[PDB]
């Protein structure tokens, strides 16, 4: 008797009637197969004499059969969503992330525990009908599949991966030609005692990265340390498993973690003994958390409650209407209730402020932007 589907359908109806007053853009597209990953590509082309620009998204497939693909889709944003490239992928794409120093390079996480590296300019637009997956690099060192995947934005070719085997693998492919070879992990970090759900390099200091795991711990690691079994700092972050973390791109000391305790925790690297803030509103386990690329105080989180919350830490502690207090805390800026299933991933558009692409379990891809009067 799990008619949460009844609650879902009715909420969706009320949301669909209220799209015009809460959104400046709503694009909905059903994919052939659901995507577990979503990330805007940094390039954008604006044709002359036209009202739309072309943005690209790195997607993947999650199929039950043996025809998985790494997908690149194009999006026409004002001021149509179509697939552009489909590359044969061994198993479903757990996560796909492009290299910041070369967005042609895309790393993927596979169910076989291998991390695959693709140069999508070295593959045809139509996938190989034979069914063979030909990665430009095969990264080895993991025993189980995972979901944490992070390119170092200050050390080119340094890639981290978090897996269910309780380990974090680091690869240095900067000196390796991408000719289909197998590369073993340069370093394996074993500080966690449970499934490592996410990993992320620090966005400014090339030697630092964070990890979160099912042991409810956030760990801050330094590659300069010789001990790979113990991190620099281990933080009891949450009262349940921690599924995601994300560093602030404008505040070198701030990071956020999302957890199965339904909360998002704010952290300061200078004093990790005190959780800065606890963002509360989510009604179920949180899977993804991402800082806004344009505003240092704006942060978003998504998860199994089929919601995407957008937070504004500058509004923490604000006095609010009693009725307004019923809708949520003051730092809760916006609740995106467009998805009718669990949201797997989401990405902030780095060229169009406040535009977000979110993907859900029901094959639904949504490209949306909250109304200007809400944040402005």
């Amino acid at each position: 008797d799990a008619v949460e589907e009844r609650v879902i359908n009715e909420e969706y109806k009320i949301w669909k009637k209220n799209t015009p007053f809460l959104y400046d853009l709503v694009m909905t597209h059903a994919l052939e197969w659901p995507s577990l990953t979503a990330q805007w590509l940094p390039d954008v082309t604006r044709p002359e004499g036209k009202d739309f620009s072309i943005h690209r998204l790195v997607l993947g497939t999650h199929t039950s059969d043996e025809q998985n693909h790494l997908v690149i889709a194009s999006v026409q944003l004002p001021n149509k969503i179509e697939i552009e490239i489909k590359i044969n992928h061994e198993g479903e794409v757990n996560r796909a992330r492009y290299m910041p120093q070369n967005p042609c390079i895309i790393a993927t996480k596979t169910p076989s525990s291998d991390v695959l590296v693709f140069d999508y300019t070295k593959h045809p637009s139509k996938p190989d009908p034979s069914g063979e997956c030909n990665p430009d690099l095969r990264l080895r060192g993991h025993q189980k599949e995972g979901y944490g995947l992070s390119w170092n934005p200050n050390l080119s070719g340094h890639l981290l991966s978090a897996s269910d085997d309780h380990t974090i693998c680091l690869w240095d492919i900067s000196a390796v030609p991408k000719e289909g070879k197998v590369v073993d992990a340069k370093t394996i970090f074993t500080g966690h005692t449970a499934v490592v759900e996410d990993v992320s390099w620090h966005l400014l200091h090339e030697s630092l990265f964070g990890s979160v795991a099912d042991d409810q711990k956030l760990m801050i690691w330094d590659t300069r340390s010789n001990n790979t079994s113990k991190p620099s700092h281990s933080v009891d972050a949450h009262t349940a498993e921690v599924n995601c973390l994300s560093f602030n791109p404008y505040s070198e000391f701030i990071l956020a973690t999302g957890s199965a305790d339904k909360t998002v925790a704010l952290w300061d690297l200078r004093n990790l003994k005190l959780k800065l803030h606890s963002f509360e509103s989510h009604k179920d386990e949180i899977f993804q958390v991402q800082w806004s690329p344009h505003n240092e105080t704006i942060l978003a989180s998504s998860g199994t409650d089929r919601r995407l919350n957008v937070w504004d830490l500058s509004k923490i502690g604000e006095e609010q209407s009693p009725e307004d207090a019923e809708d949520g805390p003051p730092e809760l800026l916006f609740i995106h209730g467009g998805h009718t299933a669990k949201i797997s991933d989401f990405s902030w558009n780095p060229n169009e402020p406040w535009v977000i692409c979110s993907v859900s379990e029901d094959n639904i891809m949504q490209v949306w932007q909250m109304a200007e009067n809400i944040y402005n």
Partner: peptide, 12 residues
């Protein structure tokens, strides 16, 4: 905890 990915995804 919720599975990171569903057991059987469906084609559209």
């Amino acid at each position: 905890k919720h599975r990171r990915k569903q057991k059987t995804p469906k084609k559209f």
